[PDB]
From Swiss-Prot, chain B:
Coiled coil: none
InterPro entries: Lsm7/SmG-like, LSM_dom_sf, Sm, Sm_dom_euk/arc, Sm_G
Assigned keywords, A-Z: Cytoplasm, mRNA processing, mRNA splicing, Nucleus, Ribonucleoprotein, RNA-binding, Spliceosome
Family: Belongs to the snRNP Sm proteins family.
One Pfam entry name: LSM
Boundaries of every Sm domain copy: 2-74
GO biological process: 7-methylguanosine cap hypermethylation; mRNA splicing, via spliceosome; RNA splicing; spliceosomal complex assembly; spliceosomal snRNP assembly; U2-type prespliceosome assembly
Protein name per its UniProtKB record: Small nuclear ribonucleoprotein G
Subunit structure: Core component of the spliceosomal U1, U2, U4 and U5 small nuclear ribonucleoproteins (snRNPs), the building blocks of the spliceosome. Most spliceosomal snRNPs contain a common set of Sm proteins, SNRPB, SNRPD1, SNRPD2, SNRPD3, SNRPE, SNRPF and SNRPG that assemble in a heptameric protein ring on the Sm site of the small nuclear RNA to form the core snRNP. Component of the U1 snRNP. The U1 snRNP is composed of the U1 snRNA and the 7 core Sm proteins SNRPB, SNRPD1, SNRPD2, SNRPD3, SNRPE, SNRPF and SNRPG, and at least three U1 snRNP-specific proteins SNRNP70/U1-70K, SNRPA/U1-A and SNRPC/U1-C.
Curated annotation (Swiss-Prot), chain D:
Subcellular location: Cytoplasm, Cytosol; Nucleus
Protein's UniProt name: Small nuclear ribonucleoprotein-associated proteins B and B'
Sm domain sequence ranges: 1-83
GO MF, one example: U1 snRNP binding
Pathology noted in the entry: Cerebrocostomandibular syndrome: A syndrome characterized by severe micrognathia, rib defects ranging from a few dorsal rib segments to complete absence of ossification, and intellectual disability.
GO aspect biological process, one term: 7-methylguanosine cap hypermethylation
Residue range from the parent sequence: 4 to 89 of 240
One cellular-component annotation, GO: methylosome
From Swiss-Prot, chain E:
Record: disease: Mandibulofacial dysostosis with microcephaly: A rare syndrome characterized by progressive microcephaly, midface and malar hypoplasia, micrognathia, microtia, dysplastic ears, preauricular skin tags, significant developmental delay, and speech delay. Many patients have major sequelae, including choanal atresia that results in respiratory difficulties, conductive hearing loss, and cleft palate.
Residues that bind GTP: 21-28, 89-93, 143-146
Protein name per Swiss-Prot or TrEMBL: 116 kDa U5 small nuclear ribonucleoprotein component
Species whose genome carries this gene: Homo sapiens (Human)
Its job: Required for pre-mRNA splicing as component of the spliceosome, including pre-catalytic, catalytic and post-catalytic spliceosomal complexes. Component of the U5 snRNP and the U4/U6-U5 tri-snRNP complex, a building block of the spliceosome. As a component of the minor spliceosome, involved in the splicing of U12-type introns in pre-mRNAs.
tr-type G domain sequence ranges: 12-294
UniProt xrefs under InterPro entries: EFG_II (IPR041095), EFG_III/V (IPR035647), EFG_V-like (IPR000640), EFTu-like_2 (IPR004161), EFTUD2_N (IPR031950), P-loop_NTPase (IPR027417), Ribosomal_Su5_D2-typ_SF (IPR020568), Ribsml_uS5_D2-typ_fold_subgr (IPR014721)
From Swiss-Prot, chain F:
Domain Sm: 3-75
SUBUNIT field: Core component of the spliceosomal U1, U2, U4 and U5 small nuclear ribonucleoproteins (snRNPs), the building blocks of the spliceosome. Most spliceosomal snRNPs contain a common set of Sm proteins, SNRPB, SNRPD1, SNRPD2, SNRPD3, SNRPE, SNRPF and SNRPG that assemble in a heptameric protein ring on the Sm site of the small nuclear RNA to form the core snRNP. Component of the U1 snRNP. The U1 snRNP is composed of the U1 snRNA and the 7 core Sm proteins SNRPB, SNRPD1, SNRPD2, SNRPD3, SNRPE, SNRPF and SNRPG, and at least three U1 snRNP-specific proteins SNRNP70/U1-70K, SNRPA/U1-A and SNRPC/U1-C.
Disulfide links within the chain: none
Protein name per the record: Small nuclear ribonucleoprotein Sm D3
Post-translational modification: Methylated on arginine residues by PRMT5 and PRMT7; probable asymmetric dimethylation which is required for assembly and biogenesis of snRNPs.
Origin organism lineage: Eukaryota, Metazoa, Chordata, Craniata, Vertebrata
GO cellular component, as recorded: catalytic step 2 spliceosome; commitment complex; cytosol; methylosome; nuclear body; nucleoplasm; nucleus; pICln-Sm protein complex
Gene: SNRPD3
Parent-record interval covered: 3 to 79 of 126
Single GO molecular function: telomerase RNA binding
Principal location class: cytoplasm
Amino acid sequence: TYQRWQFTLPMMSTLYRLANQLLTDLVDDNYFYLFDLKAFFTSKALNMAIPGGPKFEPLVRDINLQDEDWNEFNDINKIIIRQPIRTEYKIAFPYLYNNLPHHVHLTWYHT
Amino acid sequence: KAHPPELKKFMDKKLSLKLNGGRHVQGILRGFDPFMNLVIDECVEMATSGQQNNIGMVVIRGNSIIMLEALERV
Amino acid sequence: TPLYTDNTANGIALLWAPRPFNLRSGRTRRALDIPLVKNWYREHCPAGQPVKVRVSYQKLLKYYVLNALKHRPPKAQKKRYLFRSFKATKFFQSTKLDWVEVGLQVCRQGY
Amino acid sequence: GKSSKMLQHIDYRMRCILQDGRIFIGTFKAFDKHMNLILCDCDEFRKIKPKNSKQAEREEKRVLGLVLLRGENLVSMTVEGPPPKD
Amino acid sequence: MDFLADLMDNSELIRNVTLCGHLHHGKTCFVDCLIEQTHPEIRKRYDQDLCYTDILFTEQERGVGIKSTPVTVVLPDTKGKSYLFNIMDTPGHVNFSDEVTAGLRISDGVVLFIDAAEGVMLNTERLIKHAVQERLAVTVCINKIDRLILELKLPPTDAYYKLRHIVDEVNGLISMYSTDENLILSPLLGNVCFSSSQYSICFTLGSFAKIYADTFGDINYQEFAKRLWGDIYFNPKTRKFTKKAPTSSSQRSFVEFILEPLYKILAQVVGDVDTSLPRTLDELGIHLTKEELKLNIRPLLRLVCKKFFGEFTGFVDMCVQHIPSPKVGAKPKIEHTYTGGVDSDLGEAMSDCDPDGPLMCHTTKMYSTDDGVQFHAFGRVLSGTIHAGQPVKVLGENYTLEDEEDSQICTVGRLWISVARYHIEVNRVPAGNWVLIEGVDQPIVKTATITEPRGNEEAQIFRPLKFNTTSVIKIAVEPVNPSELPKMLDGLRKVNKSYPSLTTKVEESGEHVILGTGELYLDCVMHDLRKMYSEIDIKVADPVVTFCETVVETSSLKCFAETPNKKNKITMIAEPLEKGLAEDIENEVVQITWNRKKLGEFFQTKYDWDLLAARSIWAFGPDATGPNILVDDTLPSEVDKALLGSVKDSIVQGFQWGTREGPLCDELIRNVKFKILDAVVAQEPLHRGGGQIIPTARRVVYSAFLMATPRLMEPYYFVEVQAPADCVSAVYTVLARRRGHVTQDAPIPGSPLYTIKAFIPAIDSFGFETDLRTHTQGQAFSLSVFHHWQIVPGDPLDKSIVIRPLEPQPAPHLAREFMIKTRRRKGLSEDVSISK
Amino acid sequence: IGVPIKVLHEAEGHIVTCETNTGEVYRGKLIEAEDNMNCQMSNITVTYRDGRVAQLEQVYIRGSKIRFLILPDMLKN
RNA sequence: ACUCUGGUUUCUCUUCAGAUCGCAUAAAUCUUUCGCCUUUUACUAAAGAUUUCCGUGGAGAGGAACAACUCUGAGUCUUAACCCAAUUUUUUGAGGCCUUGCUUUGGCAAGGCUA
């Protein structure tokens, strides 16, 4: 059947030694900060795509959130932008830096 | 095995002990042993008639000692 | 008992291995569904690369994330092994032969 | 060697006669190597053991509850009844 | 299982304890291990930990605990019977630590956790300092002990030295925070428990001694623990703890007899299956089945450590040794939390923790039901026993004996005091035990005290809850469409009750502003609001930082305002506060309720203020904690001293109102030494109109602030960014871009990592952690907590160039545009008028 | 580690009574319970065999002169 | 240390899918929008809902092959040289008397004397 394998620790040691060439040295999931599947999911669920992430065709037209009219508080005359609100900010905290987040996914914070 | 009794809080305190045969002693505990044999400094044994006789520092064994109660605040 | 043995370093290194080598013993996987390059594009970026490499990585990440999105099997099959039934059919028989012979047989059959 | 005599009578209501002469009837649920027994819902009587008493079967009986009898003051024990469901 | 309710009756068998953690993963792992030990039904999966303390789905998906979980059970002990431990696991985030502040009043003992590899952290240090200021017992737990054993693979002697260094640093921090003689913490003293929280490996010196006694011999475990804990060394020839260290090549007792067996077991398990051979297992006195051996390395190690190291009896023994019973520990809690004083008869009875006395339960935690429609108020019952259906008066945090209308009567339904199974079978709960009162949620927002209706007519609620962190990040909330505006508002109320740190304010500009401490905090707030408390989609604004207004120079000319009644005019001059006074007053060092002589002595000794100035009427902002202080320097030669005494309350009200609402941006003002120069007013009570003073007082405050040099102030956030050495310089580059200043930088003792303490302005702090983590390619990690107000560059009212709508302003121009934008957003007049 | 000694050690802190071999019954809060049944209590009430009752602020009775002990019903569950 | 305990490889057959069926990933049809647009083959690209398709697990059944080797838990479940009791039983100094009150007698509770 050749379906299940029960092996020993030294065999893993030597196989890992041999396969170091094809395997990256990353060991902590924090390296996949904004490249885990959930970050790409919440990027696809929005128009904004992270620079390292691919672009996507929006699920719907979303004309409501495309170009909203100026409001009493939405006016840029009052909003102060010390730093640009990049796509990293929106993907990191989709429920804060994104008006009408709607159907999004949740990303792991830290390891 | 061979744990000693918790008599550190009652060390140097005036207490009354009951010894076998209906005996009553009162004095300051001068120490304790692993078998519960303690030293009573300035012990005064109270007789059955009511009179008390001071015997000084003596050694009370825990085999004939029924129970001790401290006369001061623990 | 030796506090430090020769196999301590190997085991403690394996304890932080990637997914395939972290498991002491498990079940097999097929040859075609073991993506070696999978861990490559999942990294942040192959830094120091031409623009075309970036575009290829982004597009393949898009394909991977689209594959990851729609993944639900309703297939509560009856385990009807059609291939095994065809093997059991009297119109076909079983034998053993080299792979290259089977390949030339299939080429002739396709012709 | 086996020691199955002490675990078979455990959890049942037994009446044990102590060294002082009192009869304690209680649910013997725990024992020890020094013969110290634990009787849950124990009642100690010193008048007589009521076994078909026409005039009276309970005289000088005091129910204490969860009692711990030492093995140095215990003499013998007899089975009285099985334990309840609760 | 009725013994769980039976043990609740015994007031001396309860151990009210709250947990703390560097990261919520470590503390919750320990809580899950405790639950698994207590509850055999729940077993953690091999792939991921159960994490029973992460009730919310947001915490489960994000990985960081959101709300504190007060769940625990009856647990046994090595030398003692089972005690009903109740533990409120707290989140491991700097901002979320504000929630842990509530636990500060839930229990009187903090079982702090410190990671072995990570060591001391900013969150851990802040929690330790806050607990020391909260007068609670501290029992440290070396967490993730396997990290030093496995992850770092450090030598056993080096690992012991690192652990000793961590313990010494903790002891030094505790001694700096508090001067009590009980600050000594060590395994010999019993204040340190080595609990990796992974593989179920927890113990103390006493636990190891008990294991040794069980294995062979009859050695007294207490003496062995007292001897082997430190570096007293062991002599084999003398075969005793020999402090002189006679043997040349011997290892310390803890290293030789405690750390070494754990290292050997870990090496045998991880090294190979033949390394952890059945012969080695038999030598360790364990016979695992073939199925357990066939498991992977991590499950095998977990099973081996769990079977070998008992059932966490050492932690229970350590808690029982130091964390007191509620009967013993209620008196210090009565002294601290209660604002009515322990000398009160009801207070004295509560200090004795009498179940049959008056009912005095303080509820501060708020928990949403599964449906989310109703809430439940979680709190300790200091005195009395609450019964289902019994009416009770729930005096709020703002309740006072002046007005009885501040409290309302309500009925208490099912109690659901037991939380381990989250069941509501509890009928009544005695004093000293945590109760989840149901049905009284509506009258109370947060931190309110329930009491018996008619038994007591003078008992008052405890002191209002205080937090170390300060909410400085403000965000606006609007609905997508106003048609269902109230529904969202309903959820907003559900937000205010659920999160004590979050502050919901209805601004005069018709905007609902939520104030929180951290970006992740407000993100979790909005997630809970949208998903649970208000299903309506909510539009937001860009995060803004609450700003402060300060002075740098004394007022040029006096400012006077005249009351309408017969022109009664008060004149004053404002001056900048003395350097260093703001944080001293804000740290509750000196209160307005202090005696005049004591305050005068303090000011003459520390700040060398004039005795006459100290004897003046002192305001010190709202609740005597506002850095903006007010001194009534009116000359006694004037006949207005009697009038000032008759108008002291009005003057104080005007000053506190002006402190709450300043002239620029109407925000909080700090470090202003408002000197009441003089006041001329008719002695007739008719001319002393109450409503004619406070507006005049705030007008005088505004004019004096304008007369003095005005400056803007931004909250500089302390950030303890931990990062690998190579990226350390690059980390500074991040602070270079976000206008950050590096305060200190030190390598982590015993770890390749490197900590950097920096002071990032709040304006650029939004997303700073994201920039640091992405730029360092997911290696560096940061955690920012508000540290101190720092004066912003520029002048708020100086005529400067108007900035572009979408371009950062130059540094000298920041203050003016901040002021104009804040004034316009608040809804007040944008232009600042010198006449006004 | 005995079951009765473990039940006596777990019953410390609650109200329980103990009848000694001399007939003196002392009822009170068990402050400390030893391994050999030595019980130290505080604020107990001792009644002798003659009927005289008294109150003791703190006492410590050894197990050698103790006959039996009755604990509360909360330890049964 | 004693009695029962009893296979795993396999081949197929019939069911049910919980479980990232699978730590991999296609295709077809239909449906709504987007580029649409020149008719279908088609597309572009996403969503929605099916289906086939490569595979897999659980569970059950029937033959072959190691079926006699048991694995294993359960079944209280098996021993002496020389030293031992001031708290839990093969060393324990807890022994005697009179009076008072109750009970029809028998017996029960208290005090002292003692060596």
